[PDB]
Amino acid sequence: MNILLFGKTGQVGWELQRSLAPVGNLIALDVHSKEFCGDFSNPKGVAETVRKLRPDVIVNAAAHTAVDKAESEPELAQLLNATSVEAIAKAANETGAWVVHYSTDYVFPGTGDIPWQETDATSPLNVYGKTKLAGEKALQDNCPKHLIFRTSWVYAGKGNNFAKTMLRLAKERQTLSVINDQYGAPTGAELLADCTAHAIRVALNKPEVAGLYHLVAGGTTTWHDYAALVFDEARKAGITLALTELNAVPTSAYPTPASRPGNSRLNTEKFQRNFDLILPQWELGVKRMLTEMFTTTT
Amino acid sequence: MNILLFGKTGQVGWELQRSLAPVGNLIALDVHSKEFCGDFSNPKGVAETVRKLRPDVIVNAAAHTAVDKAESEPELAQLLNATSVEAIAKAANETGAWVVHYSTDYVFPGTGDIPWQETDATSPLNVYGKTKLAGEKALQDNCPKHLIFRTSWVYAGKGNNFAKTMLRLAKERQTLSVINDQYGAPTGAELLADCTAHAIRVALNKPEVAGLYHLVAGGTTTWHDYAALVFDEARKAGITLALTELNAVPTSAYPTPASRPGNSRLNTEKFQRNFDLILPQWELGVKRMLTEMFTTTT
Ligand SMILES: NC(=O)C1=CN([C@@H]2O[C@H](COP(=O)(O)OP(=O)(O)OC[C@H]3O[C@@H](n4cnc5c(N)ncnc54)[C@H](OP(=O)(O)O)[C@@H]3O)[C@@H](O)[C@H]2O)C=CC1
Ligand SMILES: NC(=O)C1=CN([C@@H]2O[C@H](COP(=O)(O)OP(=O)(O)OC[C@H]3O[C@@H](n4cnc5c(N)ncnc54)[C@H](OP(=O)(O)O)[C@@H]3O)[C@@H](O)[C@H]2O)C=CC1
Ligand SMILES: [Mg+2]
């Protein structure tokens, strides 16, 4: 049984090369895949590889994820987050393949306290959310064998991430200022990839689980609380920091082209009973990646 | 459903903290676990934590793995690779918990060409192999709900490994000399942990799969061929190397207290059909860890 993976070199995709490797025979691609087209710009191009490879499961981790630039390039985001998904969906339905795809909390507005469920109404605040919603609707309509996982604040230790950019500030700077009103749950690429591997194995035996799922680490926190923990662990690890005065702030204080949401809390009870899997507190994931980041030996 | 993991900070254990995290509620320990005894020296000590925690699945990645030192300290190896396993097995059988445990190719002699199967006869060449065999026999006899995975040449990117120590030589040195007659298959901690997570989920629904399994990346190579690939990829990555003359050698040329085997090839067909999982060629695993090692940004 063969698995096709697009977006191989992303945060989640890099971890999915690991997790999908024993599930089945894996073929992994990206934009610069030379011997197979993986550029989500050319949707009939990606679609022709689906038809030319004939996979049992397609896992799509390729996506336009520059939230702000998106507003200035709305049509390029549509192509990547909706046009090529529909294209890929339809081609998957020709051979009854499964399609696994990732979405976002930006499909919802911002109305604090309450965590958003699957049956809830959707009102996208910005373009990213708008385009990504379109993709999930295109998929749902064009292919009944799908698994949609909406996630949030996704990070990995390979490459750029929040913790990193903040630490880098904390080394170079003395007093920092970061948001305390956008609430959410940081989700590791490790967790998303690992859960995906098991959901695929269940899906294959129990078609009834097809559908849409909320999938994020447990708990709830803010960018501020988040950075406090990154500083706290840095210190405990013996990193020195030039930072000394940590200040919390409103959203309004910081410009941003795209409207960021206030309430990114997602209820994940559905995924839990449907797949019989645990979703751990966000803090474990972050401490783990921080510890791989700080234990740098060559 | 609760999972108990010993040997949390080892190569395989570090990756099992990741992989077992969604399978069930995880409790992870090591020697210095302060609020729970994880020191495999005190077998009634580890056993009391099994009884005091009451887990559905126990996964044992703690072990004495210093192959040579073992000959000079044979009784300390027995304690760690056999005494505490038996102790843990018996206590697991009190509550019908599963026990997942790791063994080795050193349970077999050395008689080239042919890859060793599960039904094959065992004749341990050194103490490590001897003690570890004892453990797997103690487990099989004391607990019918077990999964034994014999593996080989196990590596990880966190910490010390073969590739690393060789590169370090290749930077510092000009002509290197490494073995070409011990044949085997390098197996990643990533793969062992990932496969373990899925085998646990099958085991739980299908008790019939309990037993002993060979579990190693596919393919076959030698320490020399192995190092050639580590150098080849280093160069391709733009690392510079002071190495220029790579020479292959016999085993005899190098001293070693413990008798190392010649034929570490393991047939893994059993694990494959029994769990419906793919086992990928060793080269993927190694290239992946090399690429995480070489892409060092802070
Ligand atoms: N980061 C986050 O905060 C969130 C992510 N998600 C969802 O998770 C999934 C992946 O996110 P993540 O892996 O973290 O983000 P990444 O940006 O790491 O991954 C997206 C992938 O799309 C690739 N890509 C870019 N342009 C193209 C193109 N023209 N054709 C094909 N591939 C292209 C990207 O490569 P490159 O960057 O090198 O161009 C990258 O490989 C998506 O559904 C995403 O929306 C959801 C909510 C939040
Ligand atoms: N490395 C290899 O080539 C092979 C490994 N295996 C099997 O895989 C499994 C794990 O190997 P791997 O993870 O690679 O090896 P590691 O040495 O990385 O892991 C073994 C663990 O045992 C821990 N440990 C050491 N002493 C004690 C003690 N007194 N009480 C409790 N724990 C202790 C070790 O910690 P610390 O080192 O910090 O003391 C480490 O955490 C074992 O079955 C092993 O035999 C099999 C064949 C080959
Ligand atoms: Mg990793």
UniProtKB/Swiss-Prot annotation, chains A, B:
Enzyme class, first EC level, given as a word: oxidoreductase
Keyword Magnesium among record annotations: yes
Record text on cofactor binding: Binds 1 Mg(2+) ion per monomer. Mg(2+) is important for dimerization.
Result of changing Y128F: Loss of activity
Short name of one Pfam family: RmlD_sub_bind
Protein family (similarity comment): Belongs to the dTDP-4-dehydrorhamnose reductase family.
Record function comment: Involved in the biosynthesis of the dTDP-L-rhamnose which is an important component of lipopolysaccharide (LPS). Catalyzes the reduction of dTDP-6-deoxy-L-lyxo-4-hexulose to yield dTDP-L-rhamnose. RmlD uses NADH and NADPH nearly equally well.
Quaternary structure (record): Homodimer.
Protein name: dTDP-4-dehydrorhamnose reductase
Organism: Salmonella typhimurium (strain LT2 / SGSC1412 / ATCC 700720)
